[model samples]
Target: GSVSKANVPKIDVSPLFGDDQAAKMRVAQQIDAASRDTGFFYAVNHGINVQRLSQKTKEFHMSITPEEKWDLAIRAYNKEHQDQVRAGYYLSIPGKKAVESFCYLNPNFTPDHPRIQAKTPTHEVNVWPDETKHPGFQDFAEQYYWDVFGLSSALLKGYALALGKEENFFARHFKPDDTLASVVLIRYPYLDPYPEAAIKTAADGTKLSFEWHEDVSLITVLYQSNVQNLQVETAAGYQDIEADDTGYLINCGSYMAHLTNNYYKAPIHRVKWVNAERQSLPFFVNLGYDSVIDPFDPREPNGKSDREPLSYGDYLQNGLVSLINKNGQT
Candidate 1:
């Protein structure tokens, strides 16, 4: 075979929104091939209001409380250890991510929900910043989270049809209200490139690069700058993937591979150091707590599962605890 590089396909996903079954299948097949090939693709006409999502995120970057932003001294090294994975604010240290973010879960999982009341760290209600601080942020965050979720849900249909199942194959897994998904409002400021030895340092250290990692969600729907600073590893080596200003970037995550018995690959991606401050939002589409991730492929003829089945909540809780427990780094 000849040497080759992967081309991250730009898919017109609007067809998935219509009643045209044939058109939808064509779109599904494209998604199938893209997922099977590199597990990353662009979703154009993905139904996200770029103006609304962008402006709100930018507005959120501004501060209302002058002293409140970084006034509270963290008891530990930083916010990551306390809640390895959750809602609320977290600012990674310089040699770490060198980024700031506010994470939010599906709004319906309020304090009244059994999960939130259970008090497990994994099921906390969204910790919204005070309305007095970030005006209109609450409303925009509430709506925008679902805005991305709707796109993720609709994309699942493409994955479903591609897997040779009913279009609603994932519906039972990702209920709109009971979703395990989360949206992270992230901000990144350009810093002079640093050395790899600086990776995973303490809060005071300056880490300029975003280390590579694969997301653990089922899939990630990202709205980021069109800057050609993001890269995903392919057979040809690390290749740059640019975001379309109005389009969303989609990629399969670890859970997707688990659900498909590794039939679908997960790409390891990261942001390349660029000289600019930018706002990015990634909606991690995860399976509901009750959703079971069976490694057997439904499309296969009597395909046996290589791994034991586990609920998403159980798997997530275990991983989080493990991450949190490892409190130190070299």
Candidate 2:
């Protein structure tokens, strides 16, 4: 299904973690209300250590040479000994089940009309570049992942308080065993072909940037580059999220949508190709294996049905299966 066009809302955060209690209450209110509406917000004054964060990313990117990429690819291709499974494609899987693909759930989903076919697959081991070969490899990436995650927790708590729940209400979902988090670094070479829409010839025809879709993981904490063309769907219309030079853009995932019974809207976003070459870093966070998820609240609009709160993990897995069979791989 196509997402309706609406821009994610923006709100400046206050560096007041240790401020007065009353002031904290006011801030919580703003966060809570905003979440119920958009499920996204660009925070200012989040107090994240930018220099440390940037330093680690720069080092990691610099160290991953072309030779390393080839080595990593070979290692992944030879992982059959581990009994790994491949995730299914977007078009072939049925809607009644979850189509396993590259460790992520791609429900073979078709909307009001069926467009393609997808299949069920499982047990694909992931492609992990041997960090042992890279200097300060996994160490820096792991630290960056946790740092961002900790900050995200605090931000989410503000939403809980805003919703009249205890600060830790949603925190339970992120317990050490409740979720899996990872970070990635990508680079585009000048020789890479730009997408048709991305190439533009002004007075001189020159190859521009490229466009791509986000794959693998639910929520993404993105540190944007100077190149523009970032957009998201909101209740109102399609809108662009202005990137911050030193700040990050946090996005909610479909899992969050399951946790909130769809009350927490997961915005549909895309990266458009532009005229300038650009680079971006987005940290991906996922729910842990064996964790159960579902719509927690059961109160219908008319107050007729109020089922028990469901685990986000359980609901999503089961929902994926249903979506696959019904819609043909969502």
Candidate 3:
């Protein structure tokens, strides 16, 4: 019955939304414990339908032609005038590229700030697929982004309440116009014969399908496809996460860990070296670019809370960028 290491605990979050105070408090305690320990847990009846999102994810990935995929990737990296269509396609390599990904900005964000005008903004404008070539791509993307965004926001509010803070304590940081929330669309193509051992060793130097790493945002709401290579580090060891169509897998990122002053640690996770194709959409909920991360007095285990405050922009640019450049991909 064991899939891998120890099974990640599954938590039902529906009670958090109900009007029953005791029920909500109980769920919050469970979440607090989960965050403090593994930082990874399966969310059930969490209000986001994984099946619906997963289907859309697969459809979008399938619609993109091979030529179009490569073209977009090349254009994204080149940043040429003619390659403007490649705005969101960040990286693409034939055998080495583990996945092809596109990042979309918070639709509510308008680039009217001086930072945006100066072209050195913390958030980049989203590059979208051509409407004519990829019909419904825009509609689906917009609907999906906001849906997941709202869900993540709700969860964060619940966590705050669970931590004995005002329900909107964390939500207050993400205003409609300033939040840096973004959604990433990832397509992992079929690689049936990849060398598993070499993939793990640094000397072999192969691009990782997804090497061990933690996220940079406050929370990551992931809708994983049928293919299952995702794993999370546990006290025992790395545990393979099984696919669940009914719910999403939520995990605390380093930003959230920092906010909790390491009381809630970021879960270390990675995609396994495998021979399967998959698609996933993960919405990363973040605070404003300049919002400083404030640690809460965990007020739990030791009632101690101490960590240097960090701006969201600095964490992304200085911490995340350096980590990714040194490692391979997320």
Candidate 4:
């Protein structure tokens, strides 16, 4: 049987925004249960303008008035700066990839300047399409950054409480200048005429839009498209999530699992191929660039997380290098 709406979990988070400790505590309990069971859930009342964000994302992805000329400009920019494409703007060709994407660092950094990596290279400026043609794009994107950043910060506070720690425990690690947090906007093109040679299938013969994998950040908050194509692995089978205006999808990542000694499982997930093109934005919340990623203190539960201490920047760099190499680009 195919998984339906009943399978996915929805959580209301408006309580976290208020001052009532009891309401906050109630939400924390829900978060803890969801993490332990599925590592995925939907967040409502997150306080972001979903309509504005969705429209802007579509604008960028669909603005191919002069399709040939627009793609030419993007390709030129991507090729000129080899490392930047690997670290920043990534466009997918017909046979190479089904999705195209680019990432933006925290807004405090200048978008045009080259990133300077003191310990390891983990930061990159956002690459923009022609600003003259796509007016207000930069301004809109920058504003969107603060919206998602603020929401992610608030959720982390709830996560800390769920893990039996001070409310500000994880939130304290996110600093304006030092944090390497990023937002990745992905445009998945329509694949009805997809190349059969390149298409991937699951064991049950279902076509896949993206391969199954776990994210590398502490948490990944997704604004899924209206079309329902996402699936998460469960004990029963892969479940399809239904689209609704009520909330955003939230999932634990590898970093969270590492920090919690695998007490919180990072859900494995993938996207199913659909006939229509869709766009989703994921805000990848990470630790400060220089902060060390180590196990929790021995006094706490799941404290003996046996992992080597690694700087957050180094961890990010390693993940990026592995991905670029796999794509055989840059």
Angstrom error of the Cα, residue 222, model 2: value is 2.5
Candidate structures ordered by lDDT, highest first: 4, 1, 3, 2
Query: For candidate 2, lDDT tens digit of each residue in 1-330?
Result: 222434445555553355465665677766656556655566667777766665655564456555444334321233433332222111111222111111221121222212112222221223444657655645555555566777766665665565456666555566543354434443322323433432432222322232222223445566655555566545554455565656667666666555566555566555443534334666555554444543454235542323454544454446446544543322
Strongest candidate by TM-score: 4
Q: Highest lDDT: which candidate?
A: 4
Lowest-scoring 10 consecutive residues by lDDT in candidate 3? 78-87
Instruction: Kindly list the per-residue Cα lDDT of model 3 for residues 1-330, writing each as its tens digit.
Output: 243554567888887666787787777787887787767777787786667666777777778776565555534365453423313665656555556777777665446755456654456666666788887787888888777777777788768876778778788887767777777888877765654433664223423466777887888888777776777778776766777656778888888777776667788887766557777778887788788856776656664666778888777666556666756444
Q: Roughly what TM-score does model 4 have, to 2 decimal places?
A: 0.87
| Comparing 2 and 3 on lDDT, the stronger one | 3
> lDDT of model 2 at residue 84?
24
Candidate 2 Cα deviation (angstroms), residue 63: 4.0
Compute each candidate's TM-score over C-alphas. 0.85, 0.64, 0.86, 0.87
Mind giving the per-residue lDDT tens digits that candidate 1 earns over 51-73? 77878887776563434444321
* Runs in model 3 lying further than 4 Å from the true structure: 1-4, 70-76, 81-87, 111-115, 118-120, 192-198, 202-208, 299-304
Measure candidate 3: CA RMSD.
3.7
Candidate 1 ranges beyond 4 A from true positions:
1-6, 64-66, 70-85, 92-97, 191-208, 298-300, 320-330
Give the clashing pairs for model 4.
none
Error of 1 at 49 (Å): 0.7
lDDT of 4 by residue, 139-220 (tens): 8988987888788888887888898778887888877766777877778777767866445787877887666777778888
